[PDB]
Enzyme design. Sequence first.
Site, PDB file in Angstrom:
ATOM      1  N   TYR C 123       0.811  -1.203   0.000  1.00 31.93           N
ATOM      2  CA  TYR C 123       0.000   0.000   0.000  1.00 31.93           C
ATOM      3  C   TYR C 123       0.847   1.256   0.000  1.00 31.93           C
ATOM      4  CZ  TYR C 123      -3.396  -3.480   1.497  1.00 31.93           C
ATOM      5  OH  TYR C 123      -4.186  -4.597   1.589  1.00 31.93           O
ATOM      6  N   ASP C 124       2.135   1.135   0.294  1.00 34.95           N
ATOM      7  CA  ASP C 124       2.960   2.304   0.552  1.00 34.95           C
ATOM      8  C   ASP C 124       3.484   2.930  -0.731  1.00 34.95           C
ATOM      9  OD1 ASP C 124       4.753   0.270  -0.120  1.00 34.95           O
ATOM     10  OD2 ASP C 124       6.014   0.521   1.638  1.00 34.95           O
ATOM     11  N   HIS C 160      -3.275  -3.987  -4.870  1.00 33.33           N
ATOM     12  CA  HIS C 160      -4.215  -3.869  -3.757  1.00 33.33           C
ATOM     13  C   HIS C 160      -4.559  -2.431  -3.397  1.00 33.33           C
ATOM     14  CE1 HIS C 160      -5.119  -7.926  -2.390  1.00 33.33           C
ATOM     15  NE2 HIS C 160      -3.876  -8.263  -2.678  1.00 33.33           N
TER      16      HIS C 160
END
Lengths: 102, 958, 957
Positions: C123-124, C160
């Site tokens: 997610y980063d 994601h």
Amino acid sequence: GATHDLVYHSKINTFVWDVEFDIVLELNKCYFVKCFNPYRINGDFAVSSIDIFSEGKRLLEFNFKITKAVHVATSKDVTEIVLHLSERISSPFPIVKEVVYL
Amino acid sequence: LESKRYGEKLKEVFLMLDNNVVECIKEITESSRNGKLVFFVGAGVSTLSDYPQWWRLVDKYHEELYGSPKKGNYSSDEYLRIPQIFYNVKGEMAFDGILKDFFQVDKPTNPIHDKILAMNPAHVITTNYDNLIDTACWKRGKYFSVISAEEDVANATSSRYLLKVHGDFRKGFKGENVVLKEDDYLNYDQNYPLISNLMKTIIATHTIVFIGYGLGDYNINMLLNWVRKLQKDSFHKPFFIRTDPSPIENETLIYYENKGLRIIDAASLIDSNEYDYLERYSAVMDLLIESQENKFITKDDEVIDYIYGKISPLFALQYIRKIDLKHVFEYDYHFEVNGTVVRHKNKGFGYMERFFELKESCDERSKLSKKQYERFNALFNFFEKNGVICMAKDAGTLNTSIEINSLAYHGKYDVMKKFIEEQSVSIEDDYKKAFFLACLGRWEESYDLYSNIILNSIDESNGCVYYLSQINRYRIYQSITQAVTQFNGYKPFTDEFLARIEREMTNFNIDDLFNGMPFEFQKKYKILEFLSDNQFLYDDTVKLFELTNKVGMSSDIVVLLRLYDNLRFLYENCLWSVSFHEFHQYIRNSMSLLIEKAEYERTRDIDELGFFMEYYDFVNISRHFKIDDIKNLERSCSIDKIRFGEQEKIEEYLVGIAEEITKQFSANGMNVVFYTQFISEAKAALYFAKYVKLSEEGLGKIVKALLFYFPERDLDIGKRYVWLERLTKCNELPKSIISIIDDFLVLQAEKHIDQNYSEVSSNGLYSRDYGALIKHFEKNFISKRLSEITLCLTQDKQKQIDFLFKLLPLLSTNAKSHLLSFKSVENINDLMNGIRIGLIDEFTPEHEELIIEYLETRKVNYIVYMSTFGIWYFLEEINNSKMEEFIGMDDQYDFFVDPENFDYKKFIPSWLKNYNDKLLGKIAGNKHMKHHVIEVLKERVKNSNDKRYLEILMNYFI
Amino acid sequence: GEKLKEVFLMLDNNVVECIKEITESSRNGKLVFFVGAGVSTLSDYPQWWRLVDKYHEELYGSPKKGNYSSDEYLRIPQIFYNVKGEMAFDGILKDFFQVDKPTNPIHDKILAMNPAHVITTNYDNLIDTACWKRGKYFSVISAEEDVANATSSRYLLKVHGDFRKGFKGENVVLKEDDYLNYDQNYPLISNLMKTIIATHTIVFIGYGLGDYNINMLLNWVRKLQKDSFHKPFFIRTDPSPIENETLIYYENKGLRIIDAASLIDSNEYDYLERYSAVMDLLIESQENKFITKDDEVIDYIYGKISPLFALQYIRKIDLKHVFEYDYHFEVNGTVVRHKNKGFGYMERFFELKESCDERSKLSKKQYERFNALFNFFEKNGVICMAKDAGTLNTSIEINSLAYHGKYDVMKKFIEEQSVSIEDDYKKAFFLACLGRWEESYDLYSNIILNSIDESNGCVYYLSQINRYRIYQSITQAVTQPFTDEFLARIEREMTNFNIDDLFNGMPFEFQKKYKILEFLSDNQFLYDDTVKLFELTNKVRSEMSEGSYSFGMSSDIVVLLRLYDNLRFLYENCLWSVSFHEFHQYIRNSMSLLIEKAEYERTRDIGFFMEYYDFVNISRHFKIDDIKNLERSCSIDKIRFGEQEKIEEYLVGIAEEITKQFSANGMNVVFYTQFISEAKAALYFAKYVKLSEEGLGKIVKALLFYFPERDLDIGKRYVWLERLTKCNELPKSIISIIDDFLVLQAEKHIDQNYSEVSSNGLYSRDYGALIKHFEKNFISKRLSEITLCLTQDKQKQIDFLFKLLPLLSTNAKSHLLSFKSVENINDLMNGIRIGLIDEFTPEHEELIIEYLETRKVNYIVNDYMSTFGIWYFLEEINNSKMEEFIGMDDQYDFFVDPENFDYKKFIPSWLKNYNDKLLGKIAGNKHMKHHVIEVLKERVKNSNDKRYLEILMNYFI
């Protein structure tokens, strides 16, 4: 056996090929360069000025029976061929190590 | 006829379109050029060259199942349940037999399975069961990875796909290899998992064109449900090409347009019958094939946008060669380097010819639009800047005088060091600073800042800063490697540096730099690929070879104004790729040809037997030649009869060289990476400096920066004498050069106060000659300081006494009395210095006997200074009959002591360029010397390019 | 490194081949990494169990400590989202996930592998930050509106979600419902993910063997077939080593686990050097330390050479590109090492070559691979290293019927039955070389349509280039033979075919395995050779202008044995790309340098023996004016031409091909224009060969009789016949040929208006002179009979047989001079050119007075004037009237008045044009000597001709 480097300059009749002479003029490691100055202002009448080295200029009386001539980096003395080329070519210093070509 | 009726009538159809069909022709053809055009070929192009249709089989499937064929014309999914009920009641050995009856035929392809292939598509997807596409692909020599089953996807061989998405009959005529039954459409996304994903990935990463379907046609609806489950135009809209008899209703052209399609109808463009499909498919696919024609520029607001399409990305470059501009536009309009455009092939519109007419004449310029006018202003500035002005017809005033305006070309260091220490405001600013640091030898901050450029050109979109900083970083890597292979493998770079630069530049191929880029850097900047290899100077060099053979109107303009465009693309775009030696040989053979041409065409009295040499005609000789190359030019062609101009610009160039020697070699300024670059230019630049008429401050700041500040091991003490001689034979010594050379000799005299200082010199020229030159222009000169040095002289310091005996005519009379209270003549060297400064008039006979003992030691030489004794015997100085005994020891001594027994084929081609006017003239006043020396002079006037032997043979012998 | 080389030796046999597959896919561009959340939790970024613990803290309170299981990771953020809301959910995201952690070096080692794509479940924003510091551009596709809005074909596929558009729980996949509703909220990223997986090689670099994402990819890959796909590689970096049962279980489920704890030995809490332990052992795509045995160098060489067995010759200069830039192969078969920081696999290959005691210990199929590679390297002319090699051989052999000009068998080879595509490729090259371009373009198109079934991208590609160069030959042909149906279809299919887009549109097998086949589609073929001629052109011309006769080793071997490899790649591989003129200038400057070098190093008081191949190149690639440039400068007559049974059969091959083609009907206008230039340039350089009587007598007969007009004029044949009869001597058969030629010319004058068109002004008279130059007592019988049957009329034939008057009999000259006499200048200057006037009667000189009076009519408002001034100068003319015509010629005024001629109007020439009695009475004068010596001196300077020196030596001094 170093004839793969023997060059014949034909405007002064010499044999440019790096040898290191051992002479009696008694000296060791003597190599000769020769000049070709066209209009040398005041510097006698000649073409070619010998510039004898003995690790530095020699400052000249003039004998040099060459007793041990030895080729650089492919040694085992080449004195026979040097006397042979001295026998054919009649000039001062038939084996010269560099030519300036001014 | 057909090209002028179907074509020109179709050009009337080109004019007879709505505004959506034309832009769709633009998008379809530009995607056929990009490789983003995917055709999706259907079963309306494979039912021409008639292949047995499905309603024929369902009718036979209705015939052996029920009997009494229906004639209640077949609806929807009833197409699929009659082959299904059959498969559940009759079996599969009857199903696969009716397939083997009807589908096992061989129908030869129609020309509209070939026109799809003539479009050069990226991929070809098809819903056809037959084998007519790949048969049509086989006759053009195109290889498609026929992916017709699921085990073919990673077993595919090429990246061009013939994606048979509904199965195939190449492995047997069975109903399990295709999608025919109703259950095969329901169980499709679980029997066919990889072909479906690869299909719908192509659809959302390309431009899709439907070429065989109807607007019913359940396959299209299966692709219109899935594309409806997407977002706000994530995708691009598929184009449908509808070739039906009736024209389309407007409501079904609005309905399917928002559902996702974009219909190009083929019956609202032509007018024809009910049962002729082949010329509707031909009507759109002869109007789509014109990717070469581009007949869209028939207005005066569309040529200006075509030129704003192929030029306007190239505003980030600062110069583009003309020779590259005939590649920018495809191979029409060979731009000649004088700004004269000639047409080459151009079978169409003269868009450049139209552009010049909507140029200078303003009455066509006012009728443009608003933003089209600003686009015209930018394009006018661009074509005006690079040196393109007109056609070749109405152009007689073709201009000259290019301007490389770069601080690095002019050698103006002086401001680079000031420009670098300023504040940076851009990446194009840092790209100039990094090129200046690289040009100043500061390669560490260059490689650091070029790596800062390739890390800072990631945010902006410019593939000409990044690519060219890449090439420059690679050529500075080759400069570091070629540096350390002479330096270490005098510590220029640390061992931490040589590790990381030989860590990241490993396996970086330069030829893989260009073909690994986005497509924006594949075509919009296509001329930036001759630089990663040495195909840069190809055309120019092969247009020098013919001119080298070939040499009213001179042809020096062809060489001299095509060289100058090569030096201007590199330095104006700040490219480090100047460290290669084919550029050097191009300039040497170019400028050598120009000087030999300009000298040959000077003595031409017309019945026989420009190149004014401005500032740019000196920088190239300086930076790219060698000293032996300039000597090759002076031996052949007399450059002294050239009429060198811009002598306030070459003079400031040479005092720029002189001040840079002055600053760098005063206390501490020498980087060993910048010294080795610059000191070759300072050598080759100051040898060609005789041809310029300098001032007193111009000469006096070059002579002082050559005698005093030009460092040893690169210019010897006697090697400076040639250079000082040239620069003081052009000008005259205005009692300031005399003060310089006097101050030089006083400096040399004080370096002999200690022993073992010997003045190492190749030529055998020494400080004596400097004394001669001083008393060659200043006959009554008395050096005060040398006089005081000899007056404070004692018994010891034997070196300094000899030095101030070589310089004996520059002394005072008390200095010569006190000085000759120490020396006399005791050997050959004091005698041959004695008559070289003048102080012996006649030989006393002890001198000649001293020569007898000297030449006796020469006899000691021959058993196991000579020519100067034979010539003294020849000019009647020596009075002796003993000196003729030394025969067979020198060929030049035996030429003068015995001029009737010397074998004259042992007479050297030279020795005649080495004699004075009294010797050449007493050689000529002889019989056999004249007879054989004239023959030597004749054969060596043949086998030489030197003009000196001719001067000897004219002025003294005949 | 060396301890890892011990780890290289300490592996099972699966890890090493997986290193081979991972690195060869990093070279191909089929390596996709699938980067996970075990590489982004080094450079610590707040983990999910920390947030679920806080999601358990403000929902229930009293944190659990009953260590978190499966899907309970996802229901605590879900119950929260259904009870507390979304403005608290997206606030805890903004608290913990809004940090800036600087990247670890193992987000950079993934990028140092050069992957095709990078897919991630992170997610980063630490990958693209790590991509930003290397200067790499990735199309960050993190939402569904990015797929066709993507800019580059390199993907950073955040599968994601992402937090670049706000720290909200709707931009990512965190809750439980976001995993259930994933394939209907995310339709395009999922398809693009699972299309990459089944079209590449996938390597997992951040995961565990639990890790529900991996199980989601292991269910889908289980729904596939019998290895439709390739197995994904899992790289497991965990503290404990893996159980053997879970290494067997996941291996059939689809993964192929490379464990990182069964390769090194370390602590429990050090992950960075396990990731470094596999990703420092995977980076060695340059090192390839896999060839440490004597059965693996033979397979490395069988990998980089064995596709190139379909070619018939490869240049050495291309072989230093076949292997990457080590081993510069010199053209004498001597390999020198260049960089080679590693294993001497060629040095090892020569040692497992000639010495047989290392050869016996090979395997079975490795021995056969050694036999094929030994035949290959032996055939191309690679023999040894440069250390233990003093016998470097010579004498290459272009053995092709098209090079030797042996037509004669090509026409026999074409009409045979074809058995292959390499057979049709030779036939099509022979048809193209025979001018039959229609069957060539048809059969080359048959080649590009028949090389679709086999797998050979060197027949197809080279037939493509040849078809394009024969297209340029058809275009260059018709711009100066073929039906109008032909010129339409060849200008229909060759439109928009870019030659530079031929190479970079091919499969990857024709991108690297045949990489040397790309200098041919452009003119970057002769680049290196030409830029290694420029320096040698300096090196041997700087030592000619100073007289440095090198007594040591000559450098002609560098030029002469690097040219010969260029002529051997094209003709042995049957390439039509010989129709370009930079090859020609390369050969002309090459051979011109070799002849000037060999002539300069001949008169040197202190090889290039010109065999068969040293004549074909001069013949085919020069011009007649270029050979004249060589003869003006360097005397080729003092060369000692060998192989004079091979050059003689070459020249009678030229002579028979002129004989056959020009007898009744044999000339195609496309083959005539190619061949007749070779027959011209070949027969001008034919003086240097000593022919036989059948050798000379079949060339002279095929030059006087069968060599067609409009390309060799009647007086233009005289130079050529003179050369070929100054080398040899006329053995009473050349006399019969030239006699039969003059009888043939005599019978063509029986009708009027036949005029013998000739440039030089040389005519059949000169042929008569040459016959009475070697055969002083010759009487032509047939010319005698023609003049004896002569009548009052036929004034042309009488004049022809007055130019040929000394070849007659005495009754023939009586009956013949019963018609003619001297009535004008032309009969007088034929009169003393056949010899029959000894002294001038004074009506002749007055006839010259009226002729030069008409020359005065010229000067008031074929030049015969200098021949009157020289007759006045050699004391033939006895007249004081002839000195009145001053200021009309500079050469007449040079002889009638040799003290008032202005001698800067004396032409550089005129001295190569005078005989021995004139040059010698010029020299027996005062001002002619004084100024003509000056002209000769300055034009011994500004010329390369050796004739002015011969004049000035032999006559003046």
